[PDB]
Design a protein around this ligand. Structure first.
Ligand SMILES: CC(C)=CCC/C(C)=C\CC/C(C)=C/CC/C(C)=C\CC/C(C)=C/CC/C(C)=C/CC/C(C)=C/CC/C(C)=C/CC/C(C)=C\CC1=C(C)C(=O)c2ccccc2C1=O
Ligand code: SF4
Ligand code: SF4
Ligand code: SF4
Lengths: 117, 183, 192, 125, 395, 122, 407
């Protein structure tokens, strides 16, 4: 029964097919559009920071991978609309698990997850 | 090693560069996957990617032939002695890649059972975020480690580099003291 | 090493086939002897070699020395009486000459070597081949006993894992603080 | 008469300062003078202990690139007649690993000056 | 006529024979490096990968890079090993591997620097059996590497290597018999000359198949791979070995692969004779082209090795020994008798009886081997009875 | 000595290469004494106390010892075929019949071993 | 006797022991006379750490045990949370369909990993690569749907983290079309291979009685001919609405389990085709705003983040919407006090979840009866008496995932 040798056909045939490997790093493969890459703090079109420093992103993080501290948007120095902005914002990427709960939490879309990894 | 007894100059520089080029290639990982990150190493070896393209296909089953210990997983308390034993039973030169957040810092599992970072038991050369890190991130970290290896000194240069790195590290303030802009 | 050296000497003495066959067969045979050394004597057992029979060591050494000396004296000088070159016989092929002799002049001994082989096989089967009454239970057979291991301490408890001690010799700790007998295989000496 | 030489290993300069503060030039007037060798990198600590001439090594278990417990295990497996090792542990649950490191003593963070001094005295005595 | 040909062998001046020895050694070195790289790459292709692609141009330096890295890596001598034998086992493995290749015919007579010499280091009246002897000596390297390591896994690897030998060595020995019958000589050059009419692969197909299986076993290669058995014994025998000692174990493995491939080419694939598409070309079997043909056939065997590794799982060494003793040895022993009877009959003019006996014997052998593979290894089993624990109602 | 001095030269080259390779392994590359590094590999677990080594694994049974014994006799017997094979043409019919009888005797021994379970354990 | 027996750690660091499983084997020669399992080298305290995170954060924890069956862990967790909430009937039909589709694709992926690692442990080097090629197709689909290749937190109490992207349905159709063809390659390497059968057939035998006594489940149990599957008995997530056959075999050995997994992949492909047919547009989260996850993820040039429509609703128009977003995101729902046991058919057997709520916003106690943990009790039965090589095959057949074992 040649069936018992079917495997030899599989490997041999795959020899003559073009390898399916993605060419990272020179030609990196396409990540999904929805991929949970690096967090990113976004700005409004006028340049103001979106992050109002509500700490909801940090609140929802299961790994405590976000540390945020808010500060007043004093008229002399305003960074975001409203009366609070995120003065200190740190993500400990050695604690981040890419779960994406932070961006789901953010009420201003200040925090997004880019496809960069 | 006689390569260390070689005096400085063009000879030692050429030995260093040749050794770095040789060791960045054929950087055989140890067959030491843990937790879910191990599945991502296997995927990195899988056809879609190809760890083999970097000469790293041979996952040395024995620590003796392994050059790189990709911890690649969460190290439980009971496992730390085993991981250290494996690291010791590898032979110089040795490098450790803390793949994943768990291996690097304990990740999401900040509790009794996890060691809170591989570096608690073995020197870590590269930290790799992700939970798990997608195979491209693993390859990126591996290439960063390749760059680190290429510049690795030898002999008298090794001693001088150790002394200089000591002098530099003695001065860096701890992360807890980087209070920039904190209220 | 001795067998291979003797094979090389045979080759030097215009016996190529004999030397090569020596290497092959004695490589195999010495490997089997090594296996039996592991099986019956030990992997790294260091024998004492102390004379257990009183005065036997000195007597054996004396007897061996005397026998060797007498044999060498009896041999004396022999090649002085003429040493014909074997090239005449090896002409036309050493293996061909050996074949001509074996299957014409010594075909009887050649056939009797088959009887030697049969006797060796029969002896091995009679003395060493354990029969049905001592056949080890198959995993299938061992997996059904009442409920094989299973109900019986399922997998037996693992050896204890302590800081500074995780070898298989270490015994696990029962809730009362005592060492669990089942945790460590009985063959091991209780320690560690 | 010899100044006891103590190796203090920690990536954090403040942990080294605290260790060098709880201990002083003399742990007690009955003890010899103490000299401190600060090391911030595990390779440097290993090289220093290879040179020997140390009476005690204080290794920070929380060291970033190479934790103190790993260094303790390494030195006890690599240096013959190595000095007693005292390990600083970042949490109570690290105690188990502190035992695995075979460090002669373990002192939890934050470093209690008196506890550290007492442990050092016990190790030197 | 008489092989080795006295007018061609033994006349090399010291410098020429030294040069040929050095050239053969360098050829084996380059072939080992090429095998290391080309395997990796072909396995990648069979798995739709690229294999080494970045270390040097097109990854050509990957194998040499790995070798130099093993050179640059710490040379371990673990405590508890039998230091003398532990250090010697790599040498015992390597030296015979290279020595065996001495009698491999890479080509016919060629004129170099005014001397007509065979394109091979030497030839012996017992060359093939000499190759067998050298390979047999080589296995002691594996066995003693496993034993001297003073660890469980190397010891199991060494024992598996001994079982390997028990399984395959008699098979190779018997496989040589039909080739000797048809060539009338054990010298490799004489065998190649005898294969001038037609390659023995067609005439001695059963012997060729048995020898192929048995050499794949001999080289500790997949699907046998038993002494190493990464998935079962971590590193097998070469556990506790690092740096160039492990490198030399692998080098010995690959040199043995090359040796057995070249020996298969010699006995069964007409040695260095040009294949049919090129055989019609004038001078194809002359000059240095025979070197090209011999290399091509050796590398087809290497391709077979890599293909087997990519496709087949690894057997249990007891299963391999069952294959060797219940199939290979019986098949080769019966084939020797069949070949002898057939040749004797045709020599005495009973050609029709010879052909009928050959066909009937091969048919019976293929039927009985199929029975063994399917009837003795029955695809049926009995049921099971209940026990203390309550059991659900089966469908 | 001809036809062999090439083998001797190649063996000398191989032996020099192998011993130099072992020396290179030992003297090239870093060396760092480490008790954990030197002790046996046991998949990461601490090796069983060598002090108590002489209680287990002293002797390693082989389940194919019978096949191991038969291997010696069969290997030493089959070598009779090589001189027979090479001289086959020169010998003639009587030698063919002699070898057929010898191989039939070997077959009887082999069949006795096989059919009585001599080849079953391993 | 003792002199003829070695005791060897198959050990955590071993290719076939998934790095963190310690098989301590007493071997006479090379026959496994006795077997023990050191477990917990991969313990993580996930069960305790759950207790300090709200619901919908414990999803990210549970998905990281039995990491080869992430969606099964998440589905078990969410089924339990909903059962305590008493909203199991309120889950949108689309959410249930997507849960079934994802669990079946996940079964295919997990079986692919099992076959790959088993073949590699048994020397089938190309088996791993082909299995991981198919798995990479499946993981492309998972990444597109959830944005993560692994440890997805996509299934949430009350539905899903987000709806499928527009292209997800077409990708899943492409899977249903190509995946059996690709699986044909892996099956050819192994199914009828003589060496594979010789290596697995008759190895690791475990009768139905043994499976019951040790509480074995999944492919091991169904290799005994018992067609027990939690998808048919005690249906969940609407599995009752799908026409699929419970794969079972009567060999009781490693090859039977391998064939069961191979056939389960085809059955899962059929179930995914059925899901695609049944899939209809609609909500993927419960309508109850008091419990529904308030986030609405959407893509833009900036990246993935809360959709601008939701941002406008909560920051500009709805005070109640803002309060609900804030509370459900921060401390999360509070589950009525109760104690529930919910089981699913993970690829390795009955993945059970005992979950206890004390009325608070955090799970009082979450315990996973991971099938691997119980299955590993069969190693002593399936390895003792066979060779170490047979032990490798038996353990691979058990297909343990130490993440689910230790947790
Ligand atoms: C000596 C000298 C100087 C001479 C002079 C001349 C000279 C310089 C050179 C001469 C020639 C020489 C000596 C050359 C040197 C090179 C040489 C000798 C050879 C070495 C190179 C070589 C042998 C190459 C080929 C070998 C080869 C084909 C290797 C590929 C092997 C493969 C395919 C490996 C991949 C395996 C793989 C996917 C590994 C991942 C497994 C890991 C790490 C995870 C662990 C893990 C596993 C395994 C689970 O099962 C699992 C299951 C479920 C959940 C979790 C897990 C889990 O955690
Ligand atoms: S949740 Fe959004 S707005 Fe609030 S602090 Fe985090 S990033 Fe800034
Ligand atoms: S991805 Fe998840 S774990 Fe990482 S920072 Fe965002 S919310 Fe926290
Ligand atoms: S980093 Fe994430 S994927 Fe990797 S081992 Fe830890 S939890 Fe698992």
């Amino acid at each position: 029964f040649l069936d018992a040798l079917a495997g030899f056909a599989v490997t041999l045939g795959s020899m003559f097919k073009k390898p399916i490997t993605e060419g990272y790093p020179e030609k990196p493969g396409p990540v999904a559009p929805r991929y949970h890459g690096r967090h990113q703090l976004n700005r409004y079109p006028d340049g103001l920071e979106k992050c109002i420093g509500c700490e909801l992103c940090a609140w929802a993080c299961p790994a405590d991978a976000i540390y945020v501290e808010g500060a007043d948007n004093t008229a002399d120095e305003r960074y975001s609309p409203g009366e609070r902005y995120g003065r200190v914002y740190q993500i400990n990427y050695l604690r981040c698990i890419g779960c994406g709960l932070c961006i789901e939490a953010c009420p201003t879309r200040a925090l997004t997850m880019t496809t960069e990894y | 090693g006689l390569e260390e007894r070689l005096p400085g100059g063009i000879l030692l520089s050429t030995v260093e560069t040749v050794a770095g080029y040789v060791r960045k290639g054929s950087l055989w990982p140890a067959t030491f996957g843990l937790a879910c990150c191990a599945i991502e190493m296997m995927s990195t070896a899988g056809p879609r990617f190809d760890i083999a393209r970097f000469g790293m296909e041979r996952f040395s089953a024995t620590p003796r032939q392994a050059d790189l210990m990709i911890v690649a997983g969460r190290v439980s308390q009971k496992m730390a002695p085993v991981l250290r034993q494996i690291y010791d039973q590898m032979v110089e030169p040795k490098w450790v890649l803390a793949m994943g957040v768990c291996a690097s810092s304990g990740g999401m599992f900040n509790n009794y059972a996890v060691v809170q970072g591989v570096d608690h038991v073995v020197p870590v050369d590269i930290y790799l975020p992700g939970c798990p890190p997608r195979p491209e991130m693993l390859l990126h970290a591996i290439l960063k480690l390749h760059d680190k290896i290429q510049q690795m000194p030898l002999g008298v240069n090794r001693e001088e580099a150790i002394r200089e790195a000591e002098q530099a590290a003695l001065a860096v303030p701890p992360t807890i003291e980087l209070k920039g802009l904190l209220r | 090493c001795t067998m291979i050296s003797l094979a090389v000497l045979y080759i030097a003495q215009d016996a190529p086939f004999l030397g090569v066959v020596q290497i092959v067969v004695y490589t195999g045979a010495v490997m089997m002897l090594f296996l039996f050394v592991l099986m019956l004597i030990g992997v790294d057992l260091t024998e004492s070699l102390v004379e257990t029979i009183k005065g036997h060591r000195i007597a054996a050494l004396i007897a061996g020395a005397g026998f060797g000396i007498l044999v060498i004296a009896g041999i004396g000088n022999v090649s002085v009486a003429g040493f014909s070159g074997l090239a005449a016989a090896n002409s036309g092929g050493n293996v061909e000459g050996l074949a001509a002799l074996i299957f014409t002049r010594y075909l009887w001994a050649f056939e009797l070597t088959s009887a030697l082989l049969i006797t060796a096989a029969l002896g091995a089967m009679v003395l060493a081949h354990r029969e049905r009454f001592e056949r080890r239970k198959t995993q299938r057979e061992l997996a059904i006993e009442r409920f094989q291991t299973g109900g019986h301490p399922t997998p037996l408890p693992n050896p204890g894992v302590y800081a500074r001690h995780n070898s298989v010799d270490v015994p696990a700790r029962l809730p009362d603080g005592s060492e669990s007998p089942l945790s460590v295989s009985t063959i091991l000496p209780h320690r560690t | 008469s010899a100044p006891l030489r103590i190796l203090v290993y920690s990536d954090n300069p403040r942990t080294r300062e605290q260790v060098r503060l709880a201990l002083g030039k003399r742990i007690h007037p009955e003890l010899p003078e103490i000299e401190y060798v600060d090391v911030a990198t595990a390779p440097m600590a290993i090289s220093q202990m290879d040179a020997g001439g140390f009476d005690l090594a204080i290794l920070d278990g929380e060291a970033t690139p190479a934790g103190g417990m790993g260094v303790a295990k390494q030195v006890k497996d690599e240096i013959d007649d190595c000095p007693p090792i005292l390990v600083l542990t970042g949490r109570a649950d690290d105690a188990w690993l502190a035992k695995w490191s075979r460090a002669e003593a373990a002192v939890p963070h934050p470093i209690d000056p008196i506890r550290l001094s007492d442990a050092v005295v016990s190790l030197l005595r | 006529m008489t092989h080795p040909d006295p007018t061609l062998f033994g006349h090399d001046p010291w410098w020429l024979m030294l040069a040929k020895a050095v050239a053969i050694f360098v050829f084996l070195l380059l072939t080992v490096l090429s095998a290391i790289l080309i395997e990796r790459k072909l396995l990648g292709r069979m798995q739709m990968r690229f294999g080494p692609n970045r270390v040097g141009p097109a990854g050509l330096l990957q194998s040499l890079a790995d070798g130099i890295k093993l050179a640059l890596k710490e040379g371990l001598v673990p405590a508890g090993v039998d230091k003398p034998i532990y250090l010697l086992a790599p040498v015992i493995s390597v030296i015979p591997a290279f020595v065996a290749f001495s009698v491999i015919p890479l080509g016919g007579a060629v004129s170099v620097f005014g001397h007509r010499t065979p394109l091979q280091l030497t030839d012996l009246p017992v060359a093939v059996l000499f190759i067998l002897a050298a390979t047999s000596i080589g296995v002691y390297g594996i066995v003693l590497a496993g034993w001297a390591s003073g660890s469980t896994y190397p010891l199991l690897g060494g024992l598996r290597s001994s079982a390997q030998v028990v399984s395959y060595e008699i098979a190779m020995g018997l496989s040589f018999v039909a080739v000797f019958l048809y060539a009338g000589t054990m010298s490799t050059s004489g065998i190649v000359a005898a294969q001038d009419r037609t390659w023995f692969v067609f005439l001695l197909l059963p012997s060729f198949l048995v020898y192929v299986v048995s050499m794949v076993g001999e080289t500790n290669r997949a699907p046998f791979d038993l002494p190493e058995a990464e998935g079962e014994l971590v590193g097998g025998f070469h556990t506790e070995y690092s740096s160039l000692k492990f490198a030399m174990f692998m080098l010995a493995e690959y040199v043995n692969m090359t040796t057995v491939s070249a020996l298969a080419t010699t006995m069964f694939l007409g040695g260095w004779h040009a294949p049919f598409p090129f055989n019609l070309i004038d001078g194809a079997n002359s000059g240095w082209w025979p070197l090209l043909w011999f290399t091509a056939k050796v590398w087809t065997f290497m391709f077979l090795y890599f293909w087997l590794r990519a496709t087949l799982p690894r057997l249990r060494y007891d299963q391999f020994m069952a294959l060797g003793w219940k199939v290979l040895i019986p098949v080769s022993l019966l084939w020797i008798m069949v070949v002898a009877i057939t040749r004797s009959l045709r020599q005495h003019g009973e050609g029709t009886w010879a052909a009928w006996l050959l066909t009937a014997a091969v048919v019976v052998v293929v039927a009985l081997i199929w029975g063994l593979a399917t009837s003795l290894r029955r695809r049926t089993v009995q049921p099971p009875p209940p026990q203390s624990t309550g059991a659900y109602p089966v469908p | 000595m001809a036809l062999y001095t090439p083998i001797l030269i190649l063996g000398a080259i191989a032996a020099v290469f192998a011993v130099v390779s072992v020396g290179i392994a030992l003297v090239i590359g870093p060396r760092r004494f480490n008790r954990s590094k030197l002790e046996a590999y046991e998949c990461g677990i601490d090796p069983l106390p060598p002090v108590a080594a002489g209680l287990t694994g002293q002797r390693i049974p082989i389940r194919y010892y019978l096949i191991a014994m038969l291997f010696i006799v069969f290997d030493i017997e089959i070598v009779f075929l090589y001189p027979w094979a090479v001289a086959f043409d020169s010998l003639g019919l009587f030698a063919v019949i002699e070898m057929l009888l010898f191989m039939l005797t070997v077959f009887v021994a082999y069949a006795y071993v096989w059919r009585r379970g001599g080849l079953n354990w391993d | 006797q003792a002199g003829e027996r070695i005791v060897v750690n198959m050990g955590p660091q071993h290719p076939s022991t998934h790095g963190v499983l310690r098989l301590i084997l007493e071997i006479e020669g090379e026959i496994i006379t006795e077997a023990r399992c050191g477990i917990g080298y991969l313990h993580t305290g996930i069960e305790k750490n759950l207790e300090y995170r709200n619901w919908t954060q414990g999803v990210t924890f549970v998905t990281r045990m039995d990491y080869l069956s992430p969606f099964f862990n998440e589905t078990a967790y969410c089924l339990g949370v909903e059962k305590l909430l008493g909203i199991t009937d309120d889950i949108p039909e689309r959410a249930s369909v997507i849960r079934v589709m994802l669990m079946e694709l996940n079964r295919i992926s997990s079986h692919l990993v099992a076959l790959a690692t088993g073949g590699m442990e048994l020397g089938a080097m190309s088996a791993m690569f082909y299995g991981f090629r198919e798995r990479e197709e499946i993981l492309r689909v998972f990444e597109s749907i959830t944005g993560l290749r692994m440890n997805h937190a996509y299934i949430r109490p009350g539905g899903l983290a987000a709806d499928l992207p527009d292209d997800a349905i077409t990708q899943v159709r492409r899977l249903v079309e190509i995946l059996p063809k690709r699986l044909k390659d892996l099956e050819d390497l192994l199914n009828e291979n003589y060496i594979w059968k010789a290596r697995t057939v008759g190895v690791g035998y475990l009768d139905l009685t043994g499976c019951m006594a040790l509480g074995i489940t999944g492919p091991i149990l169904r290799s005994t001919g018992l067609p027990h599957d939690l998808r048919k008995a005690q249906p969940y997530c609407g599995y009752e609405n799908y026409e699929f056959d419970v794969i079972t075999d009567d060999r009781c050995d490693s090859y039977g389990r391998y064939i069961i997994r191979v056939k389960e992949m085809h059955e899962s492909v059929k179930i995914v085709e059925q899901c695609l047919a049944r899939l209809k547009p609609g909500p993927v989260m419960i309508s109850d705003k008091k419990l529904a996850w308030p986030a609405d993820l959407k893509l833009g040039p900036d990246g993935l983040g809360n959709s601008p429509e939701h941002i406008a609703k909560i920051m500009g128009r709805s005070m109640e919407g803002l309060i609900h977003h804030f509370k459900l995101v921060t401390e999360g729902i509070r589950v009525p006090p109760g104690q529930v046991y919910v089981a699913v058919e993970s690829p390795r057997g009955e993945l059970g979840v005992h979950m206890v709520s004390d009325g608070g916003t955090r799970p009082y106690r979450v315990h996973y009866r991971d099938p691997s943990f119980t299955n590993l009790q069969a190693v002593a039965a399936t390895c003792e008496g066979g060779m170490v090589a047979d032990a490798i095959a038996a353990v691979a057949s058990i297909d343990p995932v130490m993440g689910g074992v230790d947790r």
